[PDB]
Design a protein around this ligand. Sequence first.
Ligand SMILES: O=C(N/N=C/c1cc(Br)c(O)c(Br)c1O)c1ccc(Cl)cc1
Ligand SMILES: O=C(N/N=C/c1cc(Br)c(O)c(Br)c1O)c1ccc(Cl)cc1
Ligand SMILES: [Cl-]
Ligand SMILES: [Cl-]
Ligand SMILES: [Cl-]
Ligand SMILES: [Cl-]
Ligand SMILES: [Cl-]
Ligand SMILES: [Cl-]
Lengths: 150, 151, 148, 149, 152, 151
Amino acid sequence: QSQFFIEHILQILPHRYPMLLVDRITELQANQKIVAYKNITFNEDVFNGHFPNKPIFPGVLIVEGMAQSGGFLAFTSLWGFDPEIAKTKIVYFMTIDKVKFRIPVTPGDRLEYHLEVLKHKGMIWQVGGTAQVDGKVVAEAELKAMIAER
Amino acid sequence: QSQFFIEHILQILPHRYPMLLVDRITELQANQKIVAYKNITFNEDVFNGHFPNKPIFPGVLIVEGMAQSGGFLAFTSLWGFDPEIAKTKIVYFMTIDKVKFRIPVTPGDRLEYHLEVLKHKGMIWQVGGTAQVDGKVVAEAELKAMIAERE
Amino acid sequence: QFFIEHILQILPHRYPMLLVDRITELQANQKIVAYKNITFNEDVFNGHFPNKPIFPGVLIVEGMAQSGGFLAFTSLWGFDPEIAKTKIVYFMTIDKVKFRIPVTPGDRLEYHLEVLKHKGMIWQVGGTAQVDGKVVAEAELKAMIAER
Amino acid sequence: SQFFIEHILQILPHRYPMLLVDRITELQANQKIVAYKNITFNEDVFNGHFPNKPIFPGVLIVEGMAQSGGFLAFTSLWGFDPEIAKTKIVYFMTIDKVKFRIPVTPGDRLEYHLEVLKHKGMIWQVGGTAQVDGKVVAEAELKAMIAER
Amino acid sequence: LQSQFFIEHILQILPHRYPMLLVDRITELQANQKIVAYKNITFNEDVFNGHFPNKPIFPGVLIVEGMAQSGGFLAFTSLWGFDPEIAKTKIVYFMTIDKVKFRIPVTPGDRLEYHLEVLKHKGMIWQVGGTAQVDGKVVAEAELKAMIAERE
Amino acid sequence: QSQFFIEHILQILPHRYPMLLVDRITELQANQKIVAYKNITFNEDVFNGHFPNKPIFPGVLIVEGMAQSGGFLAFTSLWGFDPEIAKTKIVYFMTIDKVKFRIPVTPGDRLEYHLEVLKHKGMIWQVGGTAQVDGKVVAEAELKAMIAERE
Ligand SMILES: O=C(N/N=C/c1cc(Br)c(O)c(Br)c1O)c1ccc(Cl)cc1
Ligand SMILES: O=C(N/N=C/c1cc(Br)c(O)c(Br)c1O)c1ccc(Cl)cc1
Ligand SMILES: [Cl-]
Ligand SMILES: [Cl-]
Ligand SMILES: [Cl-]
Ligand SMILES: [Cl-]
Ligand SMILES: [Cl-]
Ligand SMILES: [Cl-]
């Protein structure tokens, strides 16, 4: 497909509350790129501690959302939307590089992940891109993952 | 004076996690109307139970969100943006009428509240409006809440 | 009576949105009496409100809808956990609700719903929420049972 | 003789999700207390105790009796005094003769019945039962120690 | 029957789940005799939000609960060995708790070690006693009798 | 000093539940290095979703933990144990580089943070190091953080 909602995302990723950080897929081009996003609301538990009276979505969780997006891209590229096969795979994330945070993310923001395949050799996938809020780059990162059996 | 962010909301409304359901205020007209919104994400505890495998933002919480929007409008119309006064006030729901849910709200939606003051007298405010997602009415509601000093 | 275990087999709601603990009375297509205990040990109170525990008015209504939901499921298909696991419930309308007394921890929130009208999966009920014999709230609502 | 959650919050230092006393229905200084905690499915504890079979932890029933006994010990000496309450801490040294007879589930009103067995200085020993609708669901003896915060 | 079991194995034997599964690993196990396990204590636990604000103390009753779960694992395990399918139909219940003594407060950063020994077993009835230790020191003492019952 | 417990960490770091991922500091050298750790237990909410029936501590949270240790070093380096000045600040992640995840971290693990100061000037600190479990490197990373006025 091209558009995947939360119910579809749930069938592909093993992630669940409170670590499923991708609400909807707006664009998906097999083996090339994925545009998705996660809404940022105050009503999230992480905001209880990050930080009191100063709600700021954790930079490491922006990268996690990006990794998740990359993982969905990789998986669908190999087997498409296949819930059955999804249950038998795992995407190990081996490395993270060139991460830069330019603007803080906060409640009310629509955190949009933009990832593209940088390299794919065998079970290894290298993805990179940015996270954006209303058109502006809020962060960037590269990630390398390996695909294996669960 | 017309747009407020989560920090400004925290200084006005007494609500807190997991019952602070307004993330940002986009426009505000004293004693008249207010437009605000709350982002809906899967990463909300309410979804563990509503319902398993089928994330649906609870209709009653959409109404709560509209009430809180009215509350913000009510408080600032009264004392303006005054945190020290807001600090010791709570808000009680008095009545709810003519609410209709038209479209289910799910993760990924930007729930936009549109409230207009139908009548107010002292601490008693009567608002009515809609909750919208991508310009479409997903809910209609009318409510009356009371602002009161913690005692 | 129907205890939490039975309620779980019929209603699709789960933590932290399952707000009915026990069903004390049930009369098909007529009325249902049930309740939910209110204790400080509930997450909602962390935010409603700090230093002043007030059970949310909208949750009192949710508790009434669920009570009504249980009446709809059983009136429709009897106590059938199998048919129940395929359905969910949507709120359609809420009207004429009034809150008279705040519900707080230590209260036994009793739901009293009667059937006003029904047709197919669409049920309209109304009644009150009571604490120690006094009406703390009134309400009318219409909900729809659907295939998830 | 009757304290509601706000009063309880001013005396006990416990907070969510460890404040296990909702209301105090009876209190005789140096003698006894009767209080209760409502049990509802809407409690986080039930997610794991246990999945598909909600049962209020027996050790949490004891904790509730401890908190009640500590509330008794404290108010007996200083009464309803929020200010002093902040300068003291009632922790427990021992717990004994505990027995569980009936499982406590969502829908039950868990009533704590503690009495002062003996006390000397800041060391108080209470004991009694946990009851649901008139029946004994548990019994226990505890020895608290009141010290400076 | 092995002597070391990790969380993956504990999850298959005990029915407890978040936030009441209080045993993270088993370091030694001896059928009908004893068990040594532990639970890591971190600030990132919901219980510390209210016990207590600004002064995180791991609840004494939870230390006891942890010892009971250890004894429970030992009991079931001594009887059926590592049998997940059967474990799934049994459940251990507290019958009594006696001689509980709290000696030292447990706090975030501590490794709460459970040392339980079988004082008497007879069918589904098990009486165990032991201590909760932190860095070699006894922080708690307890004794309890449990029952292995049917889940239905 | 050289060792701080949870009560000291609370008075310095702005992080609270569920994002305070450092439990104890075992070694600290002003402007040079720090060794701290966070206990890993199944009794953590994060494990409900990462992942069901297969608890693994999130790699990004391991880095976050290293960042917090660095932040604790940075602050006490410039102000010592000063709770009054500590509450007038937060820390912002600026960059992360060279992170390798070698071994999965699970309940029962004592996640040890080893960080050294690579560069530092003003409120800008650059640290790098590893996260260890029973003396084995389970991860590596470099990061730059900034201590900023709460405003
Ligand atoms: O160690 C694991 N790493 N990654 C799992 C995983 C799987 C997919 Br599919 C994915 O898109 C991503 Br991102 C993952 O992290 C893992 C191990 C077991 C399970 Cl059941 C799930 C995940
Ligand atoms: O320190 C204990 N209990 N409570 C302590 C405590 C609580 C709050 Br509230 C407080 O502000 C402070 Br000063 C305390 O020491 C304790 C003392 C002994 C054991 Cl064996 C276990 C716990
Ligand atoms: Cl950050
Ligand atoms: Cl709904
Ligand atoms: Cl209300
Ligand atoms: Cl139990
Ligand atoms: Cl304790
Ligand atoms: Cl990971």
